[PDB]
Design a protein around this nucleic acid. Structure first.
Ligand code: NA
Length: 280
DNA sequence: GGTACCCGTGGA
DNA sequence: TCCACGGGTACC
């Protein structure tokens, strides 16, 4: 009730590195990890980077290699985890190694994603927790898209940006998808269109994490993003419906049971997040 | 000072 | 416009 999208909140995900070359990089990440793990952390860094540089090219800096390892293979794709000082392949990696199913890899990412989460830097976690954010955003997006179709309208990427993925109230879990749809219909009837932009900032700051969230849903074969519209792929109706049905659920991983001024909890938060996100 | 997400920036 | 390098930044 009282949905007001005017309350806006930038809520990022990790910036991508693997989209352009995904069909080479995803097998590389997985095979590197499967081959060299389990192993000690020190060995992992060296051996991972030495293999990845053969894919990315000899001119690639160590910093870039490290960032691929930590940001993408580790955090965003959840491909390995640590336990008692040894690095292991994750459940998600193990499954992909058996089935080679790239859409299923991304379906699982979309199923598990939430805000808040343990991908973010601690200061950003504290911000999101301070704002009372709690949402499973991919179930939610899918339900918004179903509800749009049920009401005979179609949504643009900008609609999903402003009304959903940058809306504080939606991200707080306060708003039903039908409220979003009804508001979009009213706004359009008043010739109001909306976009997400930030003062003095380039469009990547405002939109790249929004576009890229949608990309993962497209890689899962659940939607198709064209120049104008974001549309469901009803060939995958069974998966769309299964995932959409979680739209009203609290996040499976509860960020609010951690004390982020406690040194022990800070550490448990990130470890427990990785176990939830990466493993079965 | 080191590490590792954050994000300005520009080639593709 | 997309998206990723690698410096920026702030936690580690
Ligand atoms: Na709710």
């Amino acid at each position: 009730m009282n949905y007001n999208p005017e309350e806006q909140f930038r809520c990022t995900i990790i910036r991508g590195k693997a989209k352009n070359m995904l069909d080479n990089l995803l097998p590389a990440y997985a095979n590197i990890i499967d081959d060299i793990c389990p192993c000690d952390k020190a060995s992992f860094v060296k051996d991972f980077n030495n293999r990845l540089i053969e894919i990315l090219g000899e001119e690639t800096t160590k910093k870039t290699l490290d960032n691929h390892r930590t940001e993408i293979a580790g955090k965003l794709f959840g491909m390995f985890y640590e336990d008692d000082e040894v690095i292991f392949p994750s459940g998600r990696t193990n499954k992909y190694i058996e089935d080679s199913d790239q859409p299923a890899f991304f379906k699982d990412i979309c199923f598990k994603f939430q805000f808040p989460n343990g991908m973010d830097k601690l200061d950003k976690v504290i911000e999101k927790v301070g704002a009372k954010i709690q949402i499973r955003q991919f179930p939610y997006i899918l339900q918004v898209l179903l509800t749009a179709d049920n009401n005979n309208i179609q949504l643009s990427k900008d609609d999903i940006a402003y009304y959903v993925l940058n809306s504080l109230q939606v991200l707080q879990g306060k708003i039903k998808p039908i409220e979003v749809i009804e508001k979009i219909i009213e706004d359009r009837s008043n010739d109001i269109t909306k976009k997400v932009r930030h003062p003095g900032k380039e469009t990547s700051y405002s939109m790249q994490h929004i576009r890229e969230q949608l990309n993962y849903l497209e890689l899962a074969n659940l939607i198709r993003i064209d120049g104008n519209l974001v549309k469901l792929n009803y060939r995958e109706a069974e998966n769309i419906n299964y995932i959409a049905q979680f739209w009203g659920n609290k996040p499976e991983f509860n960020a609010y049971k951690y004390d982020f001024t406690s040194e022990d909890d800070k550490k448990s938060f990130f470890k427990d997040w990785q176990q939830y996100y990466s493993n079965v």
